[PDB]
Amino acid sequence: MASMERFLSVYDEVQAFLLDQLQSKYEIDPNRARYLRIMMDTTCLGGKYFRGMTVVNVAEGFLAVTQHDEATKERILHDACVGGWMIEFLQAHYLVEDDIMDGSVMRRGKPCWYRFPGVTTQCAINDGIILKSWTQIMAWHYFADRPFLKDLLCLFQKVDYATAVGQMYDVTSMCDSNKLDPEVAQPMTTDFAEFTPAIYKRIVKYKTTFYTYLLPLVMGLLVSEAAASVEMNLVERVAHLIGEYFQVQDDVMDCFTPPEQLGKVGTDIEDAKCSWLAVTFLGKANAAQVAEFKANYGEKDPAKVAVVKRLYSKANLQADFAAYEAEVVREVESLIEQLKVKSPTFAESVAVVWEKTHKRK
Amino acid sequence: MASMERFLSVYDEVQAFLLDQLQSKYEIDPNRARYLRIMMDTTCLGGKYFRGMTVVNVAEGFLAVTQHDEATKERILHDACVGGWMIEFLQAHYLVEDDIMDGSVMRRGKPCWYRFPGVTTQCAINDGIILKSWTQIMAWHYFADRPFLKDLLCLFQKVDYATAVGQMYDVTSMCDSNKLDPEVAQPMTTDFAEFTPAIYKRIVKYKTTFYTYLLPLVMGLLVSEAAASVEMNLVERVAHLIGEYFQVQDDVMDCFTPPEQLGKVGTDIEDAKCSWLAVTFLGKANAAQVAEFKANYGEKDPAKVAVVKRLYSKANLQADFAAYEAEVVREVESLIEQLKVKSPTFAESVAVVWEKTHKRK
Ligand SMILES: NC(=S)Nc1ccccc1OC(F)(F)F
Ligand SMILES: NC(=S)Nc1ccccc1OC(F)(F)F
Ligand SMILES: NC(=S)Nc1ccccc1OC(F)(F)F
Ligand SMILES: NC(=S)Nc1ccccc1OC(F)(F)F
Ligand SMILES: NC(=S)Nc1ccccc1OC(F)(F)F
Ligand SMILES: NC(=S)Nc1ccccc1OC(F)(F)F
Ligand SMILES: NC(=S)Nc1ccccc1OC(F)(F)F
Ligand SMILES: NC(=S)Nc1ccccc1OC(F)(F)F
Ligand SMILES: [Zn+2]
Ligand SMILES: [Zn+2]
Ligand SMILES: [Zn+2]
Ligand SMILES: [Zn+2]
C-alpha cells in the first residue's frame, strides 16, 4: 500500500475513534461532534503532511532492512501513521493559536480558523486546546501496550514545551530584553542590538525545528524500535541545522513570494520580526542604510514597508542567501555521512528530508 | 511540618527547578526568565489552593494509617505537593485562556493576566500554553521513577481533555445546537429549550468537576498507592455531585455577590449563560415571566440585566436553592457512607472536601 494513502486512511480511522469516544464517554451531542469534525478537518488537513509522512518514511526505511512478520510490518506502519498524525495535530494546535496571537488573516489561502463566522476567538482558543489534547488521546489509545510509550510521550512533551518557548522567543524578538516587564507596555527596539545571528538562531531552533524536524525523525525511530541505530546527538544536530534553513526560506518567502503563492499577505516587516533578511541586512549595512532601516522598520505604512524591501534588494541579500545555502548543503552532507556509521538507512531518510526541504517550493 | 507551609515551600522548589531548566536546556536569558517567574506567580498564586491541598490532605489521611519509614512519609508528602501543584497550574492554564476567550476584566480582584500592560493577548495565549506544559515537566522530573507515573499521566490527560470539552459546552450553551456551524455566525437562542437541568449538568460536570474534584481526590490516591482502598465508581460519583454544587454556588454568586467580595463584576446574564438561576427560573416560571425573561436575557443594557435579577428575586430561587442543597447534603452523606466500606480514611477526606465546599464563602 502507498504510504500517503495509508496515512490518509489512518486520519479517517483516528477521527472516527476520537468522535466516537466523545459520544460514548464525554456525552457529546451530534451537532457538537459535527462542529469538532469540521474543526479537525479544517485545521489538520490540506497541507503536504511533511511532518507526519517523515515518520512513515523513516519507518518504511527500517522495514526494508529488518526481519518481521507481515502483521508486524502492518502494526509498525500503522503506529508510524498514528505518530505522524500526532505531530500534524500538534502543528494544527500551534497554527490555530499563533494565528489568533498574531492577528493573522489567512493561512494556506483560506481564512484563519478563528476568523470563520461561526468560530470566533472565544471558541478557537479552546479548539486549539482540543487539537493538542487529541494528540494525547491518540497516543494513550493506540500505544497503550507499546514499549515505546514512555519514551514517545516524554519526547513529545519536551518538543511541545520547546515550541511554546520558541513562540515566546519569536513574539518578544522586537523588544529590548532588559525592558521586558508584565507591568509596562513594551516598546519596539530602537537599537536593533538583539537582531544578531545567534539570537535569530535561538528563535528558530525552538519555534520550529523541534516539532518540524526533530520530532518526526525521532518518532520514526521510536515506532521502529530503532533508537539504537543512531547517535542521538547527531540526529538533534541535523534536525536543528535543517530546521534553521527551513525557517530562512520561510522568512525570505514572507517578504518576496507573491501573496497568491504564499497563501498569505506577508507582514514580517510591519510586525518588526527578527527575520533572516533583517539580521543579514544589519550584518552588512553601512551607517546610513542602518538609519534608513531604523526609520522604516516595524511600521504599518506601506511606503515605509516598500523602503525596507528596496533596502534589502539594494543590499543583494540573494548572494548572502546563496552563501548560507552552500554552507548548510555542506554541513548537512557532513552530518549525513556521520549518520551512515551506524545506519545507512536512517542516513538515507535524513537525505530525503534534506532534498525535500532544499527543493520546497 | 504544617501542610500549607510544605505546599508553599514546594512551590518555590518547583519554580526554581523550572526556571533553572529553562536556563540549562532551553537557552533562556535572565530577562525572559524573570517574565516567566512573574507570570507563574501571578497566575498560580493567591487563591486558596483548594485543589492542590486536597491532594496533600488525602495523602496525610493515608499516612496516619499506613506503616512507612520517615523518609517514605516525606517522599509521599512531597509527591502530593508536586501533584497538587500540577493541578493548580492546570487551573491557572484554564483561567488565563478562559479570561481571554470570555473577554474578562478581573479575576480575584486584579486584572486578568492578558490585560497587564506588558503582557497582551499575543503573549498571554502562549503563557497559558506554557502553564499547562509545566505540569508535564513537573511530572516527568519528579515522578520519573514512580510506579504511579503511567496512571497519573493518563488520568491527568483525560481530566484536561474533559475540561476542554466542558469549556466548549459552556461557551456554546446559549446557542441552538442544531444551528452550530463554523460557517455561520451564531445567534443567541430565542426559545431557551436547551436551558434544562440535564444540559446544565453536562456543562458543569465537564467544565469544572473533573479538575476541581475528581483529579485532586484521585491524585491523592495515586501518590499514596491507595487506589485499591476505594471503589473508583464511587469516587467519580461523589466528585461530580460535589462539583455540581460548587458550580451552583458560583452561578448564584455571579448574579448576587457584591463585586468587591466576588473579585469580579459578574456578567452571566449579559453573556446569556446557561446558569443554575436561569434553568431553575425557567423550570417554575409562568408564560408571562418566561416572555419577560426572553425579552431581557443576554443583553448588555443594565436596565434589562436589572429586569432579569428582579425576575429571579420575585421567583424566590433562594427556596429552590435550599431544596437543592438539602438533596445534595443528603446524597453526599450517602456516598460518604458507601466509601467507608473500603476506607474510613478516604471517606473522611471526602467529608472534609464536602465541609469545605458547603461552607465556602
Ligand atoms: N471512568 C471514566 S471513563 N471516567 C471518565 C468519564 C468520562 C470522561 C472522562 C473520564 O476520565 C476520568 F476517568 F479520568 F475521570
Ligand atoms: N528524554 C528524551 S525524550 N530524550 C531524547 C531527546 C531527543 C531525541 C531522542 C530522545 O530519546 C528518545 F529516543 F527516547 F526519544
Ligand atoms: N530581493 C531579494 S534581496 N530577494 C532574495 C533575498 C534572499 C533570498 C532570495 C531572494 O530572492 C527571491 F526573493 F527571489 F527569492
Ligand atoms: N508546505 C511545505 S513547503 N511543506 C514542507 C516543509 C518542510 C519541508 C518540505 C516541505 O514541502 C514538502 F512537503 F513538499 F516536502
Ligand atoms: N537532549 C536534549 S536535553 N534535547 C533537548 C534540548 C533542549 C531542550 C529540549 C530538548 O528536548 C528534546 F530532546 F526532546 F529534543
Ligand atoms: N484510565 C484512568 S486514569 N482511569 C481512572 C479514571 C478515574 C479515576 C481513576 C482512574 O484510574 C487511576 F486510578 F489510575 F487513576
Ligand atoms: N435574590 C435571590 S433569588 N438570591 C438567591 C438565589 C439563590 C440562592 C441564594 C440566593 O440568595 C443570595 F443571593 F443572597 F445568596
Ligand atoms: N476560593 C474558594 S472559595 N475555593 C474553594 C473551592 C472549592 C471548595 C472550597 C473552596 O474554598 C476553600 F478553599 F476555602 F476551601
Ligand atoms: Zn507567530
Ligand atoms: Zn514566517
Ligand atoms: Zn468561560
Ligand atoms: Zn461563574
Short mmCIF file of C-alpha atoms in Angstrom, two decimals, chain B:
data_model
loop_
_atom_site.label_atom_id
_atom_site.label_comp_id
_atom_site.label_asym_id
_atom_site.label_seq_id
_atom_site.Cartn_x
_atom_site.Cartn_y
_atom_site.Cartn_z
CA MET B 1 5.52 20.24 59.30
CA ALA B 2 2.16 22.00 58.61
CA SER B 3 0.68 21.06 55.31
CA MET B 4 0.28 24.50 53.81
CA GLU B 5 3.83 25.58 54.55
CA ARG B 6 5.08 22.36 52.96
CA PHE B 7 2.93 23.03 49.95
CA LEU B 8 4.14 26.60 49.63
CA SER B 9 7.71 25.60 50.03
CA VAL B 10 7.38 23.05 47.27
CA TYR B 11 6.05 25.84 45.03
CA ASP B 12 9.39 27.60 45.47
CA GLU B 13 11.30 24.39 44.73
CA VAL B 14 9.30 23.63 41.60
CA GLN B 15 9.63 27.19 40.31
CA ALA B 16 13.37 27.09 40.84
CA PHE B 17 13.58 23.81 39.06
CA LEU B 18 11.51 25.02 36.09
CA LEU B 19 13.48 28.23 35.61
CA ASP B 20 16.85 26.59 36.10
CA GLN B 21 15.99 24.02 33.49
CA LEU B 22 14.98 26.76 31.11
CA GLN B 23 18.43 28.26 31.55
CA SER B 24 20.35 24.99 31.29
CA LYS B 25 18.43 23.39 28.45
CA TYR B 26 16.23 25.93 26.65
CA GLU B 27 18.78 28.75 26.31
CA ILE B 28 16.66 31.24 28.24
CA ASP B 29 18.09 34.61 29.14
CA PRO B 30 17.60 36.23 32.58
CA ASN B 31 15.04 38.78 31.47
CA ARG B 32 12.70 36.21 29.94
CA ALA B 33 13.19 34.00 32.99
CA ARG B 34 12.04 36.89 35.15
CA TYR B 35 8.99 37.43 32.91
CA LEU B 36 8.13 33.68 33.31
CA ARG B 37 8.66 33.84 37.02
CA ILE B 38 6.31 36.81 37.31
CA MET B 39 3.74 35.07 35.07
CA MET B 40 3.92 31.94 37.21
CA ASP B 41 3.41 33.81 40.43
CA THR B 42 0.68 35.99 39.11
CA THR B 43 -1.33 33.20 37.56
CA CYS B 44 -0.69 30.38 40.07
CA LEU B 45 -0.61 32.17 43.40
CA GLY B 46 -3.17 33.93 45.55
CA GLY B 47 -6.10 31.56 45.50
CA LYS B 48 -6.81 29.24 48.48
CA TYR B 49 -5.12 26.16 46.96
CA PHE B 50 -8.22 24.12 47.48
CA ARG B 51 -7.38 21.75 44.71
CA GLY B 52 -3.72 21.15 45.32
CA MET B 53 -4.14 20.96 49.13
CA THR B 54 -6.89 18.25 48.70
CA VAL B 55 -4.11 16.05 47.20
CA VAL B 56 -1.98 16.69 50.36
CA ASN B 57 -4.94 16.12 52.67
CA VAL B 58 -5.83 12.77 51.07
CA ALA B 59 -2.20 11.67 51.32
CA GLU B 60 -1.98 12.84 55.02
CA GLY B 61 -5.04 10.73 55.75
CA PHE B 62 -3.42 7.54 54.44
CA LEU B 63 -0.14 8.26 56.16
CA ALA B 64 -1.93 8.18 59.50
CA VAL B 65 -2.97 4.55 58.97
CA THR B 66 -0.21 3.08 56.94
CA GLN B 67 3.27 1.91 58.09
CA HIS B 68 6.18 3.65 56.43
CA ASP B 69 9.71 4.75 57.20
CA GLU B 70 10.02 8.52 57.87
CA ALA B 71 11.78 9.01 54.53
CA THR B 72 8.89 7.41 52.74
CA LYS B 73 6.40 9.67 54.56
CA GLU B 74 8.41 12.62 53.36
CA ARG B 75 8.57 11.32 49.81
CA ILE B 76 4.77 10.72 49.73
CA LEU B 77 4.13 14.26 51.09
CA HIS B 78 6.49 15.82 48.63
CA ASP B 79 4.89 13.87 45.70
CA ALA B 80 1.41 15.00 46.93
CA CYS B 81 2.62 18.63 46.91
CA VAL B 82 4.11 18.27 43.44
CA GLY B 83 0.87 16.61 42.26
CA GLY B 84 -1.20 19.38 43.90
CA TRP B 85 0.84 22.00 42.03
CA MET B 86 0.24 20.19 38.78
CA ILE B 87 -3.46 20.69 39.38
CA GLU B 88 -3.02 24.37 40.43
CA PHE B 89 -1.01 25.07 37.26
CA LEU B 90 -3.63 23.25 35.13
CA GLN B 91 -6.28 25.55 36.74
CA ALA B 92 -4.01 28.55 36.05
CA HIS B 93 -3.85 27.48 32.31
CA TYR B 94 -7.60 27.37 32.12
CA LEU B 95 -8.18 30.66 33.94
CA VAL B 96 -5.71 32.52 31.72
CA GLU B 97 -7.23 31.10 28.46
CA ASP B 98 -10.87 31.41 29.67
CA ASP B 99 -10.30 35.08 30.70
CA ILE B 100 -9.02 35.81 27.11
CA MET B 101 -11.82 33.79 25.46
CA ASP B 102 -14.53 35.48 27.56
CA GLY B 103 -13.10 39.00 27.47
CA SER B 104 -12.96 39.04 31.23
CA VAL B 105 -11.70 42.14 33.05
CA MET B 106 -10.85 41.00 36.53
CA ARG B 107 -10.19 37.86 38.42
CA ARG B 108 -9.59 37.65 42.26
CA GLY B 109 -9.77 41.46 42.43
CA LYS B 110 -6.91 42.04 39.98
CA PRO B 111 -6.72 42.46 36.17
CA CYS B 112 -6.77 39.28 34.12
CA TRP B 113 -3.23 38.35 33.06
CA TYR B 114 -3.77 39.26 29.42
CA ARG B 115 -4.74 42.76 30.47
CA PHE B 116 -1.45 43.52 32.10
CA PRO B 117 0.24 46.30 30.07
CA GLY B 118 3.39 44.35 29.17
CA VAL B 119 1.55 41.00 28.52
CA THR B 120 -1.15 41.46 25.84
CA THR B 121 -3.22 38.72 24.31
CA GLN B 122 -0.38 37.84 21.95
CA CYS B 123 1.82 36.71 24.86
CA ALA B 124 -0.92 35.60 27.28
CA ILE B 125 -2.29 32.84 24.99
CA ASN B 126 1.21 31.35 24.84
CA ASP B 127 1.82 31.95 28.61
CA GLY B 128 -1.25 29.84 29.28
CA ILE B 129 0.14 27.15 26.99
CA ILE B 130 3.32 27.20 28.98
CA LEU B 131 1.45 26.84 32.27
CA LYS B 132 -0.03 23.53 31.13
CA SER B 133 3.34 22.42 29.66
CA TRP B 134 4.87 22.96 33.05
CA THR B 135 2.52 20.41 34.61
CA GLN B 136 4.07 17.77 32.36
CA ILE B 137 7.60 18.96 33.00
CA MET B 138 6.98 18.62 36.75
CA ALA B 139 5.51 15.14 36.39
CA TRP B 140 8.35 13.75 34.22
CA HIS B 141 11.04 15.21 36.50
CA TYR B 142 9.63 14.45 39.99
CA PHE B 143 7.82 11.19 39.13
CA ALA B 144 10.15 9.59 36.63
CA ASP B 145 10.85 6.50 38.64
CA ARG B 146 7.44 6.29 40.36
CA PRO B 147 5.10 3.33 39.94
CA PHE B 148 2.13 5.61 39.61
CA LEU B 149 3.57 7.65 36.69
CA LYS B 150 1.65 5.99 33.94
CA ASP B 151 -1.69 6.08 35.76
CA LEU B 152 -1.16 9.70 36.87
CA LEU B 153 -0.28 10.95 33.37
CA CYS B 154 -3.19 9.07 31.79
CA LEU B 155 -5.64 10.44 34.45
CA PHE B 156 -4.31 13.95 34.05
CA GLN B 157 -4.67 13.75 30.26
CA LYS B 158 -8.32 12.64 30.50
CA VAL B 159 -9.16 15.28 33.06
CA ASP B 160 -7.60 18.00 30.86
CA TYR B 161 -9.47 16.84 27.82
CA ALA B 162 -12.77 16.59 29.83
CA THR B 163 -12.20 20.22 30.93
CA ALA B 164 -11.61 21.46 27.34
CA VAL B 165 -14.77 19.67 26.25
CA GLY B 166 -16.57 21.38 29.15
CA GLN B 167 -15.32 24.71 28.00
CA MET B 168 -16.94 24.12 24.62
CA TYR B 169 -20.16 23.01 26.28
CA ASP B 170 -20.14 26.30 28.30
CA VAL B 171 -19.29 28.82 25.54
CA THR B 172 -21.93 27.21 23.20
CA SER B 173 -24.65 26.91 25.89
CA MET B 174 -26.69 29.93 24.63
CA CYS B 175 -26.72 28.74 21.01
CA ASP B 176 -29.21 26.30 19.47
CA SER B 177 -27.37 23.03 18.92
CA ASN B 178 -28.90 22.44 15.54
CA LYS B 179 -27.56 25.78 14.24
CA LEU B 180 -23.86 25.26 15.29
CA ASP B 181 -21.86 25.75 12.15
CA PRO B 182 -18.37 27.13 11.65
CA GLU B 183 -19.56 28.80 8.50
CA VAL B 184 -22.38 30.83 10.10
CA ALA B 185 -22.30 33.46 12.80
CA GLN B 186 -24.15 32.05 15.80
CA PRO B 187 -27.32 33.61 17.05
CA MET B 188 -28.47 33.52 20.66
CA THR B 189 -31.29 31.02 21.32
CA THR B 190 -34.65 32.56 21.34
CA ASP B 191 -36.56 29.51 22.71
CA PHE B 192 -34.17 28.64 25.60
CA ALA B 193 -35.14 24.97 25.01
CA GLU B 194 -31.74 23.82 25.84
CA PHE B 195 -31.78 25.55 29.33
CA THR B 196 -32.64 22.30 31.08
CA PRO B 197 -31.27 20.61 34.30
CA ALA B 198 -29.70 17.81 32.22
CA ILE B 199 -27.94 20.14 29.85
CA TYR B 200 -26.78 22.31 32.72
CA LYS B 201 -25.45 19.21 34.47
CA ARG B 202 -23.38 18.30 31.40
CA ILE B 203 -21.78 21.68 31.17
CA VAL B 204 -20.81 21.74 34.82
CA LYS B 205 -19.71 18.14 35.02
CA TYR B 206 -17.14 18.62 32.30
CA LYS B 207 -16.18 22.20 32.72
CA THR B 208 -15.19 22.05 36.42
CA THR B 209 -15.86 18.80 38.28
CA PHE B 210 -13.09 16.71 36.72
CA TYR B 211 -10.24 19.07 37.53
CA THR B 212 -11.64 20.56 40.71
CA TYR B 213 -12.82 17.40 42.46
CA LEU B 214 -12.03 14.18 40.62
CA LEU B 215 -8.40 14.92 39.93
CA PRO B 216 -7.39 16.06 43.49
CA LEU B 217 -9.04 13.05 45.05
CA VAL B 218 -7.63 10.52 42.62
CA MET B 219 -4.18 12.06 42.53
CA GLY B 220 -4.07 11.75 46.38
CA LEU B 221 -4.95 8.08 45.96
CA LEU B 222 -2.23 7.60 43.35
CA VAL B 223 0.66 9.21 45.26
CA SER B 224 -0.40 7.16 48.24
CA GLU B 225 -0.53 3.86 46.31
CA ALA B 226 -4.06 3.56 47.68
CA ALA B 227 -6.27 3.25 44.64
CA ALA B 228 -7.31 -0.25 45.90
CA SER B 229 -8.81 1.29 49.10
CA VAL B 230 -11.66 2.68 47.01
CA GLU B 231 -14.33 1.82 44.67
CA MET B 232 -13.46 4.20 41.81
CA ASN B 233 -17.01 4.48 40.51
CA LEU B 234 -17.99 5.92 43.90
CA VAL B 235 -15.20 8.43 43.83
CA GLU B 236 -16.25 9.68 40.40
CA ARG B 237 -19.91 9.87 41.57
CA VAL B 238 -19.08 11.89 44.59
CA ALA B 239 -16.72 14.12 42.74
CA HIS B 240 -19.35 15.02 40.17
CA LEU B 241 -22.03 15.53 42.80
CA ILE B 242 -19.95 17.89 44.91
CA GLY B 243 -18.52 19.69 41.84
CA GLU B 244 -22.07 20.40 40.60
CA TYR B 245 -22.96 22.04 43.85
CA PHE B 246 -19.72 24.02 43.72
CA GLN B 247 -20.80 25.43 40.36
CA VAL B 248 -24.31 26.21 41.50
CA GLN B 249 -22.83 28.28 44.27
CA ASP B 250 -20.58 30.04 41.73
CA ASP B 251 -23.59 30.75 39.49
CA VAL B 252 -25.62 32.28 42.33
CA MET B 253 -22.60 34.35 43.48
CA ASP B 254 -22.06 35.76 39.89
CA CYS B 255 -25.51 37.29 39.98
CA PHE B 256 -25.89 38.19 43.73
CA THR B 257 -22.45 38.55 45.43
CA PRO B 258 -21.16 42.22 45.54
CA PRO B 259 -18.29 42.71 43.04
CA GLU B 260 -15.74 43.62 45.85
CA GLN B 261 -16.36 40.22 47.54
CA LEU B 262 -16.73 38.45 44.18
CA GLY B 263 -13.25 39.68 42.95
CA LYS B 264 -15.18 40.35 39.74
CA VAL B 265 -18.10 42.22 38.05
CA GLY B 266 -20.43 39.21 37.28
CA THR B 267 -21.73 39.15 33.63
CA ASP B 268 -23.55 35.74 33.32
CA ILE B 269 -26.83 37.41 32.46
CA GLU B 270 -25.40 39.68 29.73
CA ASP B 271 -23.42 36.76 28.42
CA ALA B 272 -26.66 34.61 28.29
CA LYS B 273 -25.03 31.82 30.23
CA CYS B 274 -26.84 28.67 30.98
CA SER B 275 -26.69 29.30 34.76
CA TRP B 276 -28.48 27.43 37.54
CA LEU B 277 -30.56 30.61 38.18
CA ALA B 278 -31.75 30.70 34.58
CA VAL B 279 -32.55 27.00 34.32
CA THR B 280 -34.30 26.98 37.80
CA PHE B 281 -36.22 30.15 36.90
CA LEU B 282 -37.37 28.65 33.59
CA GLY B 283 -38.43 25.45 35.42
CA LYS B 284 -41.01 27.33 37.50
CA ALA B 285 -41.95 30.49 35.59
CA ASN B 286 -45.37 31.14 34.11
CA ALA B 287 -45.85 32.16 30.48
CA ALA B 288 -45.65 35.85 31.05
CA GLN B 289 -42.45 35.55 33.25
CA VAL B 290 -40.85 33.42 30.52
CA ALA B 291 -41.63 36.07 27.92
CA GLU B 292 -40.20 38.80 30.11
CA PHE B 293 -37.05 36.70 30.69
CA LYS B 294 -36.72 36.18 26.88
CA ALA B 295 -37.04 39.93 26.15
CA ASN B 296 -34.37 40.79 28.71
CA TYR B 297 -31.76 38.00 28.88
CA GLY B 298 -28.33 38.08 27.21
CA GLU B 299 -28.29 41.92 26.72
CA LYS B 300 -25.66 44.40 27.79
CA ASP B 301 -28.25 47.00 28.75
CA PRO B 302 -28.11 47.41 32.56
CA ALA B 303 -31.87 48.03 32.77
CA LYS B 304 -32.58 44.62 31.08
CA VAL B 305 -29.97 42.99 33.41
CA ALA B 306 -31.89 44.56 36.33
CA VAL B 307 -35.18 43.15 34.92
CA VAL B 308 -33.70 39.61 34.95
CA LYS B 309 -32.37 39.95 38.55
CA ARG B 310 -35.78 41.26 39.68
CA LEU B 311 -37.41 38.27 37.96
CA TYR B 312 -35.12 35.82 39.82
CA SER B 313 -35.76 37.56 43.24
CA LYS B 314 -39.58 37.56 42.64
CA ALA B 315 -39.34 33.85 41.84
CA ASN B 316 -37.78 33.05 45.26
CA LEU B 317 -34.97 30.97 43.81
CA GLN B 318 -33.49 31.01 47.38
CA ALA B 319 -36.06 28.31 48.23
CA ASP B 320 -35.23 26.20 45.17
CA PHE B 321 -31.56 26.54 46.20
CA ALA B 322 -32.20 25.45 49.80
CA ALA B 323 -34.06 22.43 48.46
CA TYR B 324 -31.20 21.60 46.03
CA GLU B 325 -28.64 21.94 48.91
CA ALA B 326 -30.66 19.63 51.07
CA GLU B 327 -30.83 16.92 48.41
CA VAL B 328 -27.03 17.30 47.75
CA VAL B 329 -26.23 17.23 51.56
CA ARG B 330 -28.27 14.01 51.66
CA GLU B 331 -26.70 12.32 48.51
CA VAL B 332 -23.16 13.30 49.61
CA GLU B 333 -23.76 11.79 53.02
CA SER B 334 -24.94 8.54 51.25
CA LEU B 335 -21.87 8.35 49.17
CA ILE B 336 -19.57 9.01 52.14
CA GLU B 337 -21.15 6.09 53.86
CA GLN B 338 -20.65 3.84 50.87
CA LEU B 339 -16.96 4.96 50.79
CA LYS B 340 -16.48 3.86 54.39
CA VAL B 341 -16.97 0.11 53.42
CA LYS B 342 -13.48 0.21 51.91
CA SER B 343 -11.79 3.19 53.62
CA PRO B 344 -12.91 5.19 56.54
CA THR B 345 -9.80 7.29 55.84
CA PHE B 346 -10.69 8.18 52.29
CA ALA B 347 -14.32 8.76 53.33
CA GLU B 348 -13.16 11.26 55.92
CA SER B 349 -11.13 13.15 53.29
CA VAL B 350 -14.24 13.35 51.15
CA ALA B 351 -16.13 14.64 54.18
CA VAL B 352 -13.60 17.33 54.60
CA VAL B 353 -13.86 18.17 50.86
CA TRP B 354 -17.65 18.47 51.34
CA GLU B 355 -17.48 20.65 54.55
CA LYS B 356 -15.11 22.99 52.84
CA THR B 357 -17.27 23.30 49.78
CA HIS B 358 -20.55 23.64 51.70
CA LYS B 359 -19.11 26.42 53.93
CA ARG B 360 -17.12 28.25 51.26
CA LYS B 361 -17.58 31.90 51.39
#
